[PDB]
Amino acid sequence: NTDKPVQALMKIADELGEIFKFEAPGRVTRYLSSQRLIKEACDESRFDKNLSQALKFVRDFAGDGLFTSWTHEKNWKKAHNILLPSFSQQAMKGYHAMMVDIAVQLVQKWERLNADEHIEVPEDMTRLTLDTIGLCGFNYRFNSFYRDQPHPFITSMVRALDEAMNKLQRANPDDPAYDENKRQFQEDIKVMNDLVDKIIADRKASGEQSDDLLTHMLNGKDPETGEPLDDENIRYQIITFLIAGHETTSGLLSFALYFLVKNPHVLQKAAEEAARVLVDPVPSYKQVKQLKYVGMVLNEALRLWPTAPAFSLYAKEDTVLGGEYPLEKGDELMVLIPQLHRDKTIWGDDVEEFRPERFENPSAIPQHAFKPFGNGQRACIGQQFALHEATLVLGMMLKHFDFEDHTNYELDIKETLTLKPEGFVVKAKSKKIPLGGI
Amino acid sequence: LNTDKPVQALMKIADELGEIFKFEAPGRVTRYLSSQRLIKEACDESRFDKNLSQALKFVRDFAGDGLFTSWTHEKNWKKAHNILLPSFSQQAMKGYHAMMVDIAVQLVQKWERLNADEHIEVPEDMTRLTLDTIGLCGFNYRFNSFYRDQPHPFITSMVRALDEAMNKLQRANPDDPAYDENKRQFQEDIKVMNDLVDKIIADRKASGEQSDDLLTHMLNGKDPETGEPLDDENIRYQIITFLIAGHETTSGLLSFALYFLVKNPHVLQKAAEEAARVLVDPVPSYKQVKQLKYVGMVLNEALRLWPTAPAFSLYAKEDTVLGGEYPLEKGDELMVLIPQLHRDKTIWGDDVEEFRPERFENPSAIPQHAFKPFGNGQRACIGQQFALHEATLVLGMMLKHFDFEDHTNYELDIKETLTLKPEGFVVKAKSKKIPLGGI
Amino acid sequence: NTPLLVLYGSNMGTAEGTARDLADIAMSKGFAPQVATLDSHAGNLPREGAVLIVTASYNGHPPDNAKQFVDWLDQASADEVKGVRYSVFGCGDKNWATTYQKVPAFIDETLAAKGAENIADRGEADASDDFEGTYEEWREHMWSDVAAYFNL
Ligand code: HEM
């Protein structure tokens, strides 16, 4: 069928409307795309998170971390309540310094390019988000900007996710051609577990611990049981944060830069705000909070291409949707976030336009009209982290450089578990403003 | 007479036979000098001149008639020497300074970003430092060595062609079919070197060189004697020459220096105390590097013990007598063993093998020709001020920003190529957490 | 395009690079400069234009490429130095006590007790301090002294 299923389902939504069904032996799936029905599907007394096949395949190395767990599983609610404080807006203050630490490495790499060279945007942004979660998460440096070949953990993580995704399109999974994939798959899990299992034990034996996600997990307790997550789940959560945030966040940054160079007067306006607000060699937390238009630029990129483009739900019981579409208990609903974000009775008639101004008055926006981070208790726990990273980095980007779309890039959106502007490249022209760490 | 450590083998022999001894091959006579008095005599330019050893002749296959691999009487040595000499002065170092700090900052930041259980490969990181430093200061080009596992394609090819040239010296059978891939690989590396540097030169001529670096001086320089500038080809050979003459010599200096410091912790402490007193801004200024006097002494004393270009060759211009005792014929070869010279007890005292920076506290106390880590006369190292500026700066920043650990209790092992290096020298750095430019 | 001959006495190249630097700025000031060692024009001082003399000292003695010049200068005085309009720049180190700038000084004052057209007072560089300051002072003052003297 297609390598671009969500974009394909969007075209079908364009023709069939707010709901349509696909059926296989046993599996029926309905695809929801209006604010009107999605609003109902977001009632957690009626619908809960479903694990699609993709997540089931990712679960082979993410285990019962938060992202690939059922709501009913013990380790889900326990981890959810233990880690929730670690991800609040308040906690962002304590991650900011190390966020800046990797953001400086990004800006210094670009400062140090020869004039004939160019920038691989999703590539660099993935380097940055991976190293940021590693450092902010468990005080570990992948040092991605010091390498051609990523750190062995990252190579394996990326390879295992790719195999998980590739497994989905495989007609003959047990063909002998896939025997090496399978062995490599087991090799990659061992790499990941062995590195993460070691970092955890070292910290446990550590007598001068920090205040990162790893220490919050090592000290967090389950209210009822009075006990913390065991070290395997903690390892699963660490792998989970890298998996769930590395390409989602990098995609956001990539699409945001895409839409800025294609919309030069919006770039200018964003850049004029970075210059006014980022008045110190290194950004402060308050200052990042003052980047409102950069904040709106990101929200508009999320609106047009939310980088985790779909989430799956199941009917917890027989029920009727929109008062006219009956559901059986267990029926899966698929929420097409990019279609939702183009709901004309919500956003108006210019839904393909890149207009950050839409977010001028967030109170304007109706509940369940904008959902790039999912829904309710199963929403993205890393939303604040992600937005703080992206705002900080985009702001520093717009402060230190002018951007040229030297190839006149044609948008080509690659779909995996996430979305990305495949092959998007640019050229940066220094404004020659020094920073922190030089 | 096989061994992979000839200079070291020859110092041993010098300890047995003294200030002069000779090896003979079918058509070659080589005398090796170890005493300040004979070397002093051999450095009389009206009597002796630079000889191109076989090694230098092998490197000439890619370094061409750049300064290092040229005979004194060659047109382009004379021209290039006359045109570049002022660009290599101590004063000239003031405008190279900022780009030296640029790469020095990258080295410091790399070590700050290491995880606790990793370590530092010293000659490997000093070489990345010096190669990028020479490229940026010399011709505004960033190899960005600290952003890769595999070096920039130029560097890969240069290091390989030089290793090939050294290897040829020990090939019993160069024409064996196994050396075929080597020969064609050699031509490929030459082509990547020539192509990149040529392109940079051409882009700059076109660009109108709105810079003030060595390449600027070479394109704009005029040899007074002949009135003509260097041509594009020789200019490229000079650029190739700066990288090869300068990357592992300087590399090795900084590495031997750190070796002696961690082997001599009280000396380390004293240099660190001076780096801490003098380097008071986030990044060193030119004036502050010149105030790193003890750091300087440390560097001269490491160059005394293991000067990283440890031998240079000379030929008698006419038949003559040496020390009033040793007849030489026109064209006879003299090899100066600099680490032996540096151990002459009649000059330095009996404690020659001891790391003691304090020897150099009084420059007037050192006689002429007692200390020659940078060779002799018009053929002495044109890069001497560049290299000492880079090393004093970088070693000062290293000592300001970190404490060091000889965590493996490293056993000195001196690998010999065109240069000397403490092979396998590794340390652990512990940050003092001082920002280089701000937080 | 007046004739500017620059001679050096150098063992380690400080004086030789300074000399070649001067000849490079002369070319920019329309001269017809020539660079050579000191003891190679021993007796052949230019009886026209001017001769800049850049030299170091070694323990009170001339560098290896300057010895023939000075000796010629010391004893030999018969072949007078009349017509020769010169100037001297000294490369020295304060770290050498009693011998500080002895050779440049010797040459400078000896040249004058033999019929001097000293167009510009000698200049000194202390390697142990601010050699480019003094070199800079002497230089600017220097070009002007010779400027006014001849042409402009
Ligand atoms: C712009 C960036 C991001 C986007 C658009 C995004 C979006 C998503 C979405 C849509 C969900 C719901 C999944 C579902 O219903 O199946 C979610 C959950 C998740 N995300 Fe993100 N995410 C982002 C980055 C992050 C980052 C940076 C982290 C981690 C540090 C993170 C950690 C997670 C986790 C752990 C879950 C599962 C939460 C739970 O079910 O309890 N995400 N994310």
Ligand code: HEM
């Ligand atoms: C601490 C490091 C260094 C040491 C110990 C060193 C040593 C020497 C020695 C011993 C010679 C004379 C070789 C001979 O007589 O055959 C020499 C020549 C040379 N050096 Fe270096 N060198 C150093 C750094 C540099 C650097 C950084 C550069 C470049 C910027 C450089 C450029 C060259 C050149 C071009 C020559 C040939 C000069 C000529 O004959 O005209 N060297 N060096």
Ligand SMILES: Cc1cc2nc3c(=O)[nH]c(=O)nc-3n(C[C@H](O)[C@H](O)[C@H](O)COP(=O)(O)O)c2cc1C
């Ligand atoms: C062995 C030795 C002796 C020196 N003696 C003197 C001296 O007598 N008077 C002086 O002013 N400087 C003295 N100097 C300082 C040098 O003249 C100074 O380094 C000069 O700049 C070197 O110039 P050059 O590289 O062209 O030879 C001496 C230096 C050395 C190495």
